[PDB]
Write a protein that holds these residues in place. Structure first.
Motif, mmCIF file in Angstrom:
data_model
loop_
_atom_site.group_PDB
_atom_site.id
_atom_site.type_symbol
_atom_site.label_atom_id
_atom_site.label_comp_id
_atom_site.label_asym_id
_atom_site.label_seq_id
_atom_site.Cartn_x
_atom_site.Cartn_y
_atom_site.Cartn_z
ATOM 1 N N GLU A 61 -4.703 -2.734 3.903
ATOM 2 C CA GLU A 61 -3.276 -2.406 4.577
ATOM 3 C C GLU A 61 -3.525 -2.403 6.101
ATOM 4 O OE1 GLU A 61 -2.933 1.303 1.596
ATOM 5 O OE2 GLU A 61 -1.348 1.148 3.365
ATOM 6 N N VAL A 95 -7.043 3.989 -7.552
ATOM 7 C CA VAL A 95 -5.443 4.347 -7.513
ATOM 8 C C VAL A 95 -4.810 3.731 -8.812
ATOM 9 C CG1 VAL A 95 -4.726 2.116 -6.073
ATOM 10 C CG2 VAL A 95 -3.438 4.314 -6.056
ATOM 11 N N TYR A 96 -3.825 4.325 -9.271
ATOM 12 C CA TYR A 96 -3.146 3.674 -10.539
ATOM 13 C C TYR A 96 -2.079 4.751 -10.638
ATOM 14 C CZ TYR A 96 -5.807 7.926 -12.447
ATOM 15 O OH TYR A 96 -6.585 9.015 -12.419
ATOM 16 N N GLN A 97 -1.137 4.091 -11.558
ATOM 17 C CA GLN A 97 0.160 4.820 -11.697
ATOM 18 C C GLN A 97 0.058 5.718 -13.079
ATOM 19 O OE1 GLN A 97 2.185 4.352 -9.343
ATOM 20 N NE2 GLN A 97 4.173 4.325 -10.018
ATOM 21 N N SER A 139 -6.459 0.971 -1.116
ATOM 22 C CA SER A 139 -5.956 -0.203 -0.433
ATOM 23 C C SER A 139 -6.060 -0.093 0.970
ATOM 24 C CB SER A 139 -4.758 -0.685 -0.961
ATOM 25 O OG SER A 139 -3.753 0.592 -0.881
ATOM 26 N N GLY A 140 -6.072 1.083 1.586
ATOM 27 C CA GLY A 140 -6.061 1.409 3.001
ATOM 28 C C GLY A 140 -6.841 0.469 3.863
ATOM 29 N N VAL A 196 0.005 -2.029 -5.382
ATOM 30 C CA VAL A 196 -1.349 -2.330 -5.510
ATOM 31 C C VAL A 196 -1.828 -2.278 -7.060
ATOM 32 C CG1 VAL A 196 -2.407 -0.137 -5.165
ATOM 33 C CG2 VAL A 196 -3.866 -2.107 -4.863
ATOM 34 N N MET A 246 2.156 -1.053 -11.005
ATOM 35 C CA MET A 246 1.999 -1.074 -9.804
ATOM 36 C C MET A 246 1.974 0.435 -9.056
ATOM 37 S SD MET A 246 4.075 -3.775 -7.382
ATOM 38 C CE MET A 246 3.851 -4.801 -8.658
ATOM 39 N N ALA A 247 0.832 0.551 -8.308
ATOM 40 C CA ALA A 247 0.753 1.835 -7.619
ATOM 41 C C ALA A 247 1.252 1.598 -6.104
ATOM 42 C CB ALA A 247 -0.599 2.399 -7.519
ATOM 43 N N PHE A 248 1.493 2.684 -5.277
ATOM 44 C CA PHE A 248 1.811 2.449 -3.954
ATOM 45 C C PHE A 248 0.454 2.479 -3.253
ATOM 46 C CE2 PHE A 248 5.452 4.845 -5.483
ATOM 47 C CZ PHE A 248 6.543 4.129 -4.981
ATOM 48 N N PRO A 249 0.613 1.590 -2.100
ATOM 49 C CA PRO A 249 -0.517 1.447 -1.211
ATOM 50 C C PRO A 249 -0.973 2.714 -0.923
ATOM 51 C CG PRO A 249 1.245 -0.188 -0.657
ATOM 52 C CD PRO A 249 1.719 0.911 -1.532
ATOM 53 N N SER A 250 -2.279 3.019 -1.025
ATOM 54 C CA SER A 250 -3.040 4.511 -0.754
ATOM 55 C C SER A 250 -3.220 4.825 0.569
ATOM 56 C CB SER A 250 -3.945 4.498 -1.681
ATOM 57 O OG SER A 250 -5.044 3.650 -1.480
ATOM 58 N N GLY A 251 -3.268 3.745 1.539
ATOM 59 C CA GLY A 251 -3.801 4.071 2.639
ATOM 60 C C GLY A 251 -3.415 5.384 3.545
#
Ligand SMILES: COc1cccc2[nH]c(C(=O)N[C@@H](CC(C)C)C(=O)N[C@@H](C[C@@H]3CCNC3=O)C(=O)c3nc4ccccc4s3)cc12
Ligand SMILES: COc1cccc2[nH]c(C(=O)N[C@@H](CC(C)C)C(=O)N[C@@H](C[C@@H]3CCNC3=O)C(=O)c3nc4ccccc4s3)cc12
Lengths: 298, 291
Positions: free
Chosen positions: A12, B115-117, A8-9, A123, B4-9
């Protein structure tokens, strides 16, 4: 198989907040334009009777508070495109990725970056239902969160969030402000059409099972597309389009199973049930993995 | 309610590619150190002393970083580079507990892919989605811009589940970083998480599994152990307090609903769209998303 979102970066870095009066929602900052739902200009006394195009005449650039974090971006222009507001700001976003705006079809999947007050929260992957809703996870303050796909570092934005239906599903627009489905941006209880099963994705799921060696459902039958589509509708499955046939090509080639042969296999499953057996460890067919999602994970 | 995953940036900006000989995997770049699985040197202690700094090719996107030193910590190799990562977030290294969840950023050739939980299973595996070249991908949680790294990926078991280490290089579980077929201990179901998810279903207007009955804590646990569920502790009961407060369903009332679910099944019905009892949402996962 997991539901996997895109990293998602790149999105973001584009999220900001937009406040008009006392209402704050999220906006998308690309180059020197911020995109957000037009009803940020609405007061509690509008919303029911949206006078949005006329409400906008009374608004000026200095009525809009756009913030990256708590840093203000000065608005130098504004315009309305369907259900989105476009705010021209005096700074080009240095984190702008390569991007496109695309309008997706039902069955297609995309990643949602849920945001509150300009701040990304989580996300997850969504699928556009045939009735043009998505099963999101959105709270108060989520509007203006976007959905997207990433291909070779180019971000294709396809969704901006506007509304929760009484049934708990969600509705929104593309990035040109055109709603998916028959919804309008009013404070009003709206009903979606009765949903159907995404046939093209179920077929992709059956191809995924074959790839992994689970293929008892293959038979010696085939069908025409028309005959299958007419049977599909009797089981509340979507009819297939030529485009659906085409995006199943790569999986058909990989497994050596013609698309119409796979349709005939599904037709039997629909008419005769699963006989208690499983596919990929389930008596339930999955319809939220696209052909592209299947090759992504295989 | 969604997984729901955390934003990965914040994590994407730390992923690099590490290559040694014919082997390529992912590394994690924080300040001036790159962390990666030690078996990048395999085609390990005698093998590492025979390596030079220049045997390691580290790339952040297009640019190569210069390795100026190296050390081994358990199953992780720490490569000192001459450049500091300017996108380094505030971070911590943590060893998570079984039953806790984290976000995985799957990467290939140093590039983030998805990205995934995931949950750390009671048998110290995780049910991930990893292919060839995914080693060195990391798992993490985010707390107020602080990234807590808890997982680095090393292995896929024959059953298709996954094994890895904390960022100190110590495996979760009885696994070793060798090219061998390894079996895990018998897995169990995370009881406190199933209850959290049943509360989530109530908050989202799904109630067909609720009943009028109640149970004691010990009697619930007797049935739970019989169905290969983990024991529920009073601390778990405490942790479920807020969700019990919100819904007005006592924890032991919800336990009575789970007991009947276990002894009777779901009768084809579903809960939050699932046909199976879900155990990979922690009470905090439900709370942070529902409010
Ligand atoms: C009798 O009216 C109803 C009856 C039955 C079901 C209903 N649903 C909605 C409905 O959705 N309204 C839209 C807003 C309309 C204008 C598009 C709305 O609240 N969007 C939210 C996301 C929502 C909130 C909860 N989680 C969802 O995703 C959003 O972020 C926005 N907030 C505001 C706040 C102030 C001004 C603009 C916006 S835009 C109304 C409604
Ligand atoms: C008889 O051998 C087996 C029998 C039955 C099941 C088995 N599983 C594995 C096993 O997992 N090996 C480890 C590697 C070992 C050394 C920890 C491994 O391949 N890790 C992958 C991620 C894997 C790949 C598939 N999806 C998974 O996530 C990774 O990226 C790495 N690749 C390499 C390649 C070369 C050198 C280092 C690395 S590190 C071996 C095995």
């Amino acid at each position: 198989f997991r539901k996997m979102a895109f990293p998602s970066g790149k999105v973001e870095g584009c999220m900001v907040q937009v406040t008009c009066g006392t209402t704050t929602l999220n906006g998308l900052w690309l180059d020197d334009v911020v995109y957000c739902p037009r009803h940020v200009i609405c007061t509690s006394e509008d919303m029911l009777n949206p006078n949005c195009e006329d409400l906008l005449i009374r608004k000026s650039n200095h009525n809009f508070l756009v913030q990256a974090g708590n840093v203000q971006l000065r608005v130098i222009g504004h315009s309305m495109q369907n259900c989105v507001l476009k705010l021209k700001v005096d700074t080009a976003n240095p984190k702008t990725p390569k991007y496109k705006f695309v309008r997706i079809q039902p069955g297609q999947t995309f990643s949602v970056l849920a945001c509150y007050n300009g701040s990304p929260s989580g996300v997850y992957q969504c699928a556009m239902r045939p009735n043009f809703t998505i099963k999101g996870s959105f709270l108060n303050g989520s509007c203006g969160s976007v959905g997207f796909n990433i291909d070779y570092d180019c971000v294709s934005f396809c969704y901006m969030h506007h509304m929760e239906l009484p049934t708990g599903v969600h509705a929104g627009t593309d990035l040109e402000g055109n709603f998916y489905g028959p919804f309008v941006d009013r404070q009003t209880a709206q009903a979606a059409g009765t949903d159907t099963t995404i046939t093209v994705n179920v077929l992709a799921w059956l191809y995924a099972a074959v790839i992994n060696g689970d293929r008892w459902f293959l038979n010696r039958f085939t069908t025409t597309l028309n005959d299958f589509n007419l049977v599909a509708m009797k089981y509340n499955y979507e009819p297939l389009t030529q485009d659906h046939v085409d995006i199943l090509g790569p999986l058909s080639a990989q497994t050596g199973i013609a698309v119409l042969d796979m349709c005939a296999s599904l037709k039997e499953l629909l008419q005769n049930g699963m006989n208690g057996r499983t596919i990929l460890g389930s008596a339930l067919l999955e319809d939220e993995f696209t052909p592209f999602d299947v090759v992504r994970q295989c």
